[PDB]
């Protein structure tokens with residue numbers, strides 16, 4: 002079985018860093034903000050293997066029929082913010098609504114990902130993230146692409162969410 006995962010979130014939250022840690026097991030500090038490529042990876046989850054197709058999104062702050070098309074094939078979404086960036090946590094709501102639009106559906110598999118948990122200076126409290134995730138009916142996973150903490154879990158959890166949805 003194959004699963005199409007899409008990684009979304011505001012500029013600079015760690016979309017590309019998270020994805021490259023999962024795929025290539027290293028942390029990148031300066032990854033081109035315009036590159037929007039897909040990656041492949043077979044993984045074993047709860048005894049069952051899947052081929053993961055992960056679409057790293059980028060682009061400009063704008064509507065794009067082209068991007069809508071690449072994202073409509075997504076079966077699950079990683080909603081990423083950075084714990085030291087309040088604006089990125091506020092954008093989460095807008096990302097979820099855009100997903101609902103492109104998929105014409107309220108119950109798309111999704112996980113909320115609070116990235117950069119290695120950093121000391123957090124502006125977004127765990128409790129606000131937990132309540133937001135609670136209201137959406139989705140899991141919330143803290144991660145650090147730098148240390149690799151939570152990275153497998155973020156993606157593995159999204160796959161479980163997709164599996165349950167069928």
Ligand SMILES: *CCC(=O)N1CC(NC(=O)COc2ccc(Br)cc2C(=O)N2CC=C(c3ccccc3)C2)C1
Nearest residue numbers: 009010011012034059060061062063064092095099100
């Ligand atoms: C630095 C490059 C980068 O990482 N960026 C730019 C920003 N790009 C987007 O968010 C692209 O637009 C979307 C991405 C993913 C989805 Br799902 C939907 C959309 C989209 O069409 N819109 C229009 C309104 C948007 C918005 C987002 C946040 C706050 C307010 C409005 C997203 C990430």
Ligand SMILES: Nc1nc2c(ncn2[C@@H]2O[C@H](COP(=O)(O)OP(=O)(O)O)[C@@H](O)[C@H]2O)c(=O)[nH]1
Nearest residue numbers: 012013014015016017018029030117145146147
């Ligand atoms: N401390 C820390 N820095 C990160 C983490 N993830 C990404 N970064 C850095 O934050 C910046 C944004 O990363 P990037 O993945 O390019 O953001 P994107 O625009 O969402 O793809 C880069 O300089 C990364 O090296 C993390 O988990 N912890």
Ligand SMILES: [Ca+2]
Nearest residue numbers: 016017034059
């Ligand atoms: Ca990127």
Ligand SMILES: [Ca+2]
Nearest residue numbers: 061063064065
């Ligand atoms: Ca344009």
Ligand SMILES: [Ca+2]
Nearest residue numbers: 104105106107
């Ligand atoms: Ca409808």
